[PDB]
Design a protein around this ligand. Sequence first.
Ligand SMILES: NC(=O)c1ccc[n+]([C@@H]2O[C@H](COP(=O)(O)O)[C@@H](O)[C@H]2O)c1
Ligand SMILES: NC(=O)c1cc2c(=O)c3cc(F)ccc3oc2nc1N
Length: 313
Amino acid sequence: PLTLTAATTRAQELRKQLNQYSHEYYVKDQPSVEDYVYDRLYKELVDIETEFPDLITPDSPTQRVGGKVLSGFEKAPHDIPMYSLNDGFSKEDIFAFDERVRKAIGKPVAYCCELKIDGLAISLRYENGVFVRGATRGDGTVGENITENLRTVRSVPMRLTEPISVEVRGECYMPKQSFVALNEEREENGQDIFANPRNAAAGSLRQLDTKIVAKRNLNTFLYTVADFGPMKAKTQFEALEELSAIGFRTNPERQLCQSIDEVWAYIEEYHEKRSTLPYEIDGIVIKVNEFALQDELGFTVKAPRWAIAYKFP
Ligand SMILES: NC(=O)c1ccc[n+]([C@@H]2O[C@H](COP(=O)(O)O)[C@@H](O)[C@H]2O)c1
Ligand SMILES: NC(=O)c1cc2c(=O)c3cc(F)ccc3oc2nc1N
């Protein structure tokens, strides 16, 4: 019925259409077509790949189910170190942070505020638009190469919107809903439950069998451009927008604040909205918006001087 020639062509058509649908459903959290439309096309692709396995590609949506089983994780170095954040706990801590920033820069500074997603910090590297490496923060200079596991995280693009080479960083986490379902499953199988979604995400990414990881329903939020490649963003707020543009999932609750007072209002706003979110957050991350100014402030041994994480009590 279908020759190798026709199938080879049709397979690419399906991957493109299905990947667009997944981008809308998983990355934008806003599907355009009904599930049955996706399922019908997905099945057609599975049928083609089953008949001619040589047509299976790394960016085919059928690969999301995983299948590879590792013996262990390779070391994943971070030539551009993955620092951690300095903490703040009181309104005075946040204002003190602002005072230090102003003292160093010499003028009022705008801040890009984001929710502190409670999960595992990860780094994603793309080459010519192709996903080539996924890694945990680990100790900051060396983490674990969890590329295969991240291929199963539905919101992680296997091929970017543009064939660019960049390295980005964000959080990989488990939504409350999935955390609950998972613990119930572990209770059913006589296993120890996970204390919180953070530990659930960490344990999930430590699994060597990708098939298991694929079922953990992990998700992502990207927030840092480590290796810009051709990206043009000059501020953090611009970077979040650009991360979205090239195909990554970004958190929609960020806000650019012109004053420390607006920053505190943001903190209080989301401090009370906290329980309404589908994911857990342990605070707010306040970042100097201008990259030029972030560069001026630099980093201590432990963290950047241009950011602070307000931790919820
Ligand atoms: N409507 C859509 O665009 C869309 C995209 C991806 C997955 N889904 C749904 O997500 C579920 C899981 O499918 P996948 O594992 O192929 O991502 C299915 O129920 C599927 O229909 C829907
Ligand atoms: N958990 C988070 O949602 C979150 C975490 C970090 C970091 O750990 C982080 C570490 C750095 F060295 C620099 C910026 C950062 O920005 C961050 N931004 C976020 N939104």
